[PDB]
Every structure is written in structure tokens, then in C-alpha cells.
Homo-oligomer: A and B are copies of this chain.
């Protein structure tokens, strides 16, 4: 059975995780794990309560690891237990993936050094200090690393993973079973397509968070420099 693991942490953006989870859980011969320091409740940034299924120590060797994003990324970037677990699993995983600001956690773990990667548009300037080559594309692959942008990036890249782990017909069947054919009613999902006034509002709303994450990123980079 293919072993797929998601890191589940306080203040996660739950859709970053629950989207790819439902897609990948639809495949045959897959086991999906929700990983934290111990099994039990973990609260997402919206207040939704999820349940971790396994601890770091008990998690099996993973074929796929996925790091979601969210408000809670700042704490994770300085959590030595979580970063060590990610490094251990990434060493043998076939795929190391992230959604949105989850790539900043991969960066803090040292896994983006010299690698092409993306992250959420408002935090993209934090990739270079973590050693990455920043790329402004929705899905960026570099070897076995796959970083994606957008709250539903993991739905789309989960179909890619399905095709590579199984075959294209299997990925197509899952897409059809889920009737997955999105059609957003607005075209404001990128700073390059949204109205300038909307970009301004979104930027100011993110400013305090970006400021705090600049400080965290510099401490995380100092640890990588040692």
C-alpha cells in the first residue's frame, strides 16, 4: 500500500489538506495519515476541529509527504521536532510536496536549498533567504519536490501524483468520479489578474503577518547557516 502523510498542525488552513486528502483517499491501495506530535484533536485556523491519526514516532515510512499552509506555519518554522521529522521522511519519500505557505516549512527544514519553488503570492519574497530559486508559477517541480500555490493546489497535483503512482486512466477515473471541473465565477485568484484596488486591500491585510514572518524567516535562515 502506498503511504501518504499530511502534517496536521494548529492553525492549519484546512482546505490545503482536506482537498488532496479526499482525492488521494479515493485511490486503491493507499493509506493516508494525518500526522502530529500525538494523535488527537487539532484545530484549524477557521475553528474546524480535525483529528491527527498518528504521532511522529509511530508514522510509517512515507511514499508521499505533504505540508499544508496556514497561519500556523510561523510556529512550525521554528519547531525542531517537526522540522526533524520532515527531513527524515523527505530523505526516502518518492514525493515531497507542499501547498501555499507550506513551502516555507520545507524552506525552514533546509529542503529548498538550491531548488526551484513557489509559495503564496504575499509571502513569495521569503523563499530566497531560505535558499530557494523563487519561481512565479502555480506548480513548480524540481526533482521529487512539488510546490503549489492556491488553497486547492493539492487537488490538482494529487491528480498528477495519481497518474504517476498508478496510470493516467486511474487519474482520469478519479476526476470523473468526483465530477471535478472547476469554473470560478471571478478571475481574481492572482495579483496579476485581480483589480489593483483588491490587490492593495489584500496586501495591507497581510502586512502584519508578513512582518512577523520576515523575523521568523531570518532566524530560520541563521539555523541553516550553522
- Chain A interface (Cβ < 8 Å from any Cβ of B): 13-15, 18-19, 21-23, 25-26, 32, 34, 41, 46-51, 100, 120-121, 138, 149-152, 155-157, 159-160, 163, 168-169, 171-173, 175-186, 188-191, 193-195, 197-199, 201-202, 205-206
Contact = CB atoms under 8 A, between A and B. Distances in A.
The 5 A-B residue pairs with the shortest CB-CB distance, nearest first, are A181-B189, A172-B188, A15-B22, A25-B46, A182-B182
A177 B159 contact: no
A136 to B, nearest CB: 12
Nearest to A25: B46
Given A25-B48, A159-B185, 20 more contacts: A14-B21, A15-B21, A15-B23, A18-B48, A22-B151, A32-B46, A49-B50, A49-B51, A100-B179, A151-B180, A152-B180, A152-B182, A169-B197, A172-B188, A172-B194, A175-B189, A176-B194, A176-B198, A180-B184, A181-B193
Contact of A177 (B160, B182, B205): B205
Interface of A is mostly: mixed
Contacts of A50: 48-50
B138 A181 contact: yes
A202 B178 CA distance: 10
A186 B175 contact: yes
What is the copy number of this chain in the assembly?
2
27 contacts: A14-B18, A15-B22, A15-B23, A18-B48, A22-B48, A22-B151, A26-B46, A32-B47, A34-B48, A48-B50, A48-B51, A49-B50, A138-B183, A149-B179, A150-B182, A152-B180, A156-B183, A157-B185, A159-B186, A169-B197, A169-B201, A171-B186, A172-B198, A173-B188, A176-B189, A176-B198, A179-B189
A151 B169 contact: no
A147 to B, nearest CB: 13
Nearest to A120: B179
Nearest to A200: B173
